[PDB]
Design a protein around this nucleic acid. Structure first.
Ligand SMILES: [Zn+2]
Ligand SMILES: [Zn+2]
Length: 922
DNA sequence: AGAGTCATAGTTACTCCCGCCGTTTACCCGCGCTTG
DNA sequence: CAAGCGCGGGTAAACGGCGGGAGTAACTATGAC
RNA sequence: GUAGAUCAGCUGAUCCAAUUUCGCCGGCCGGCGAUGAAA
């Protein structure tokens, strides 16, 4: 009987039909569930607004009633008789009376600075005065870009290609210069707002200790000045402080040091026009360093509002996203009105009046010196614009707040405070007895309210205060999410028809199915459900870009996975989806590295030291990250944060996170905090192929060629290194996994050794690779001999000594200042403990005596104790032996960079042996 | 030295019906100011 | 001074929120084969 | 024909290879600056 009219399914019971409707047909059923609005209950915010307006009207007039109140409130949406009826309530007049009563009220430092200024000025003066070819040019550009500022290259490669900007200088100068030039006409703040907000240590001379404690990310690009971070680092700190104090006294920076070159960055990976970029400014390095100190000082001096959780000593994005999710979940669960309006200010930093800013700083309480410095800096400030390579015409800026400066996000925090103080005192959401009203991150404002009139009043208040400040509200992204519960039917419903106005301009009302992004996280009207995870496209982009395999691996390690880490941590992802995603990652990495499909799982994801590829496993890393980030929510200083942490939704999320992490981790011994690194480590060494890698952990330097020194080796040899390191060479034994139904020809050596053909056998024991082994030994001994000579010693390679026992061939003998060392070199299979092999090699040299005295006499020193036994022992997979490492770095002094390279030689020699075997396979 | 699709249970996000008391406001009833 | 209009008390008859109860379509993990 | 090689039908595509362009100091040859995305 019961049959749907859109999916054409007949269900046994009306319950089935309705539940099917709620999923298969969201929009139409949501419209059907819109409640009638005959006699809506009087929410508290309506009562507060009514009482306040009645009180002010009585104070200015003396008498009031519904007739004039209606005129006072045009958009209240209550009938002239409904208002009169509500007027009869006693607590209402009590609040009216309460509000009425409330209304009843050295030469060298200057020399070096001048040298830097002259160099910058000379640079400024100099500056002012086919498909195959396309791909080659792109390769050159990408390599040069990645060599200098990695983040730029990663963002370009993952997102789009072909220059990125793609819009040239035109379409920017025509679209931005007029805005950057126009002077704002903000009248300033009203005295009412100043009073509402009303609810010295700065400028002191900077000291050496504070600047030293002032951290700096030296991995930064220089500005138009041309002063690179290297020389600035080279300057001693005390002279830095001298110049900083000199500037403090002068209250200004040298003219040329303020000039900045504007650059554009896309808000969206696929910009549709010139207006979707952020015209950031890169000031000179010394100016940024100088302003960081004041940024920290002002951060410590006057903290922002409690609701302000942007650029502070806390993860504002996490708290805001969690709070929004908790609010939405609570509203859905108990069917309570909640209007959430996401607000953004287009040209946010580039729309604030200079005069309003400086005067507000004056009234707020900063010292006159600081306000005057800001005013002077922004009065004569000027900028240059340059996209791609175009020193455009310089521009004089009429609106301040310079994106990229350390002070700008803090100075704008004053305006943020002012506007945050303007919303009505009693509008918000009562989330677990806590009133939450606004969630601010930088400029992105999210206003919450429990009533339509309350939300409209809040919107109008923020609009007018911004207009007074000079800011203008964007209608492109601003939207209002509204949920009206349906009591007597227990149905959640969303409004559709637009009803909110920013200064007469209607807003876009987000429907139920729409997806909108907040802080870069996808949000649905029902809460964070999932991320579309366009990972296939990103992997295709990375694979198609002109990069060597290690470049792609590093990008996937450090820039792609973290980017979607936020979407997944703040989203709701089922571990099956995570497994599919990590399988996709594994397949892509196997393609890039040309590995087969039988390589052990753990190899990809085990951390660098344990010998893995350090490619983060989403399936396990994500639960760990969400547990770590949501554990501290209960202990956050913010009261609303603690209230959210007690929400049912977050509790369930954390429970599932704990279960997953418990399943994919082992408790650490020392810190007792579960770690995923241990899980992959255990799996890798237990694997048949990785069994020989069990010694990597004890020697961190054994694997330095995977991540730090990956730039000194070509792509091809890196791929070969990875192939042999995990034993990916398709030998017959390794080629018969599951196909051992054949005869001995399927397992014997081709060369005729008649023994089992193991990759170790091919690399070490087969006679055909005899000369290969010798040349590998010669190469490694030559390298270590050259380095050890470079460490001020004596060299006599392969001393020909005929001892009583017979003919013995030591690797190298050494002698310095009367002390000599007998160093032996050899490579050994990893199937046995490397240190026992080291001891076995050392016994037959250091425990003979007669050869010890022979080498002592040859070197010319009589005492035998000065001669010591040592063995350079490295497994053919390139894994170090701990005891050998220690003795080599301690008994004889060698810097670690030299020791970092021995595994490279061992690995290259082993693969050369393999390829030689295959070459003379005949 | 391998990388199981598939059967079944658990679950989540809903559904709907019935009934309960509390809440809101369209009528109704006047009084005071204005105009004929 | 009387009729009319705007300003004010009262009433009750439906809305509205929530409790209680009885199911299920569409995923999402494994326990075992 | 490709910086080189390879597979195709002088053109295309893949690679384990692939530093483009402008200005300069200079003698087709050497060196320099740009070709730098926030906190
Ligand atoms: Zn249907
Ligand atoms: Zn053999």
């Amino acid at each position: 009987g019961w049959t749907c009219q859109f999916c054409e399914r007949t269900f046994s019971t009306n319950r089935g039909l309705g539940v099917h409707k709620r999923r298969a047909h969201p929009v139409e059923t949501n419209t059907d569930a819109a409640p009638m609005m005959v006699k809506r209950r009087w929410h508290g915010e309506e009562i507060d607004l009514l009482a306040r307006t009645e009180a002010r009207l009585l104070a200015e007039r003396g008498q009031c009633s519904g007739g004039d109140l209606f005129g006072a409130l045009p958009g209240f949406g209550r009938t002239l008789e409904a208002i009169k009826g509500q007027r009869r309530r006693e607590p209402y007049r009590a609040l009216v009376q309460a509000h009425l009563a409330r209304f009843g009220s050295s030469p060298d430092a200057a020399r070096v600075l001048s040298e830097l200024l002259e160099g910058a000025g000379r640079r400024r003066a100099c500056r002012a005065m086919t498909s195959r070819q396309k791909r080659r040019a792109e390769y050159a550009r990408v390599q040069e870009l990645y060599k200098k500022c990695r983040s730029r290259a990663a963002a370009e490669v993952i997102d789009g290609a072909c220059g990125g900007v793609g819009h040239s200088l035109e379409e920017m100068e025509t679209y931005w210069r007029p805005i950057l030039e126009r002077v704002s006409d903000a009248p300033g703040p009203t005295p009412e707002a100043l009073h509402a907000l009303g609810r010295t240590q700065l400028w002191k001379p900077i000291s050496v200790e504070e600047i030293k404690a002032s951290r700096f990310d030296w991995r930064t690009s220089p500005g138009p000045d041309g002063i690179r971070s290297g020389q600035w680092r080279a300057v001693p700190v005390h002279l830095k402080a001298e110049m900083f104090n000199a500037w403090m006294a002068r209250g200004e920076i040298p003219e040329i040091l303020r000039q900045c070159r504007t650059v554009f960055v896309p808000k969206v990976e696929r910009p549709g026009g010139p207006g979707e970029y952020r015209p950031i400014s890169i000031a000179s390095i010394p100016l940024r360093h100088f302003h960081s100190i004041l940024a920290r000082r002002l951060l410590a001096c006057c903290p922002p509002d409690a609701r302000q959780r942007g650029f502070i000593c806390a993860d504002g994005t996490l708290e805001n996203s969690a709070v929004l999710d908790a609010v939405l979940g609570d509203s859905r669960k108990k069917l309570r009105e909640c209007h959430v309006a996401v607000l953004d200010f287009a040209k946010a930093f580039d729309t604030v009046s200079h005069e309003a800013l400086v005067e507000l700083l004056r009234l707020r309480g900063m010292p006159e010196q600081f306000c005057g410095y800001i005013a002077h800096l922004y009065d004569t400030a000027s900028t240059t614009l340059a996209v791609n390579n175009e020193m455009s015409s310089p521009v004089k800026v009429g609106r301040g707040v310079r994106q990229g400066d350390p002070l700008s996000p803090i100075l704008f925090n004053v305006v943020m405070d002012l506007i945050l103080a303007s919303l009505p005192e009693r509008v918000g959401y009562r989330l677990e007895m806590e009133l939450v009203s606004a969630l601010a991150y930088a400029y992105d404002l999210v206003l919450l309210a429990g009533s339509k009139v309350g939300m409209q009043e809040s919107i109008s208040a923020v609009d007018c205060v911004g207009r007074q400040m000079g800011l203008r509200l964007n209608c492109r992204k601003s939207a209002v999410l509204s949920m009206i519960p349906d009591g007597h039917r227990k149905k959640h419903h969303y409004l559709t028809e637009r009803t909110f106005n920013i200064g007469g301009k209607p807003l876009r009302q987000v429907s139920c199915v729409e997806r909108w992004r907040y802080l870069g996280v996808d949000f649905e009207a029902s809460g964070c459900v999932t991320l579309e995870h366009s990972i296939s496209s990103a992997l295709n982009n990375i694979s198609r870009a002109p990069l060597k395999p290690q470049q792609r691996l590093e990008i996937l390690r450090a820039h792609l996975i973290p980017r979607f880490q936020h979407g997944f941590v703040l989203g709701n992802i089922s571990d099956d989806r995570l497994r599919m995603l990590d399988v996709q990652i594994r397949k892509a990495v196997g393609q890039w590295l040309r590995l087969p499909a039988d390589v052990p799982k753990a190899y990809y994801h085990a951390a660098v030291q344990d010998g893995g590829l350090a490619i983060p496993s989403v399936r396990a890393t994500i639960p760990d990250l969400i547990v770590r980030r949501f554990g501290g929510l209960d202990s956050s200083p913010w009261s609303v944060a603690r209230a959210a942490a007690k929400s049912d939704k977050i509790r369930k999320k954390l429970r599932w996170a704990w279960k997953q992490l418990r399943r994919f981790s082992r408790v650490d011994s020392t810190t007792q905090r579960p770690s995923v690194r241990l899980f992959w480590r255990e799996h890798l060494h237990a694997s048949v192929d990785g069994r020989e890698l069990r010694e990597s952990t004890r020697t961190p330097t054994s694997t330095k060629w995977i991540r730090e020194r990956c730039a000194q080796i070509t792509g091809r040899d890196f791929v070969q290194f990875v192939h042999t390191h995990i034993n990916a060479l398709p030998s017959r034994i390794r080629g018969s996994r599951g196909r051992r139904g054949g005869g001995e020809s399927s397992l014997t050596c081709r060369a005729g050794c008649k023994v089992r053909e193991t990759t170790a056998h091919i690399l070490q024991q087969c006679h055909r690779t005899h000369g290969g082994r010798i040349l590998r030994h010669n190469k490694i001994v030559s390298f270590v001999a050259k380095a050890m000579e470079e460490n001020k010693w004596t060299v006599e390679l392969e001393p020909r000594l005929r001892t009583s026992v017979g003919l013995r061939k030591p690797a190298i003998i050494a002698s310095r200042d009367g002390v000599g060392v007998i160093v032996d070199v050899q490579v050994v299979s990893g199937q046995r403990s490397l240190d026992e092999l080291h001891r076995e090699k050392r016994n037959k040299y250091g425990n003979h005596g007669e050869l010890v005295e022979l080498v002592a006499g040859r070197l010319g020193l009589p005492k035998a104790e000065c001669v010591r036994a040592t063995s350079c022992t490295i497994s053919w997979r390139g894994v170090w032996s701990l005891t050998s490492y220690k003795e080599l770095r301690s008994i004889i002094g060698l810097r670690e960079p030299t020791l970092q390279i021995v595994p490279i030689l061992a690995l290259r020699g082993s693969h050369m042996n393999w390829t030689r075997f295959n070459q003379m396979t005949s």
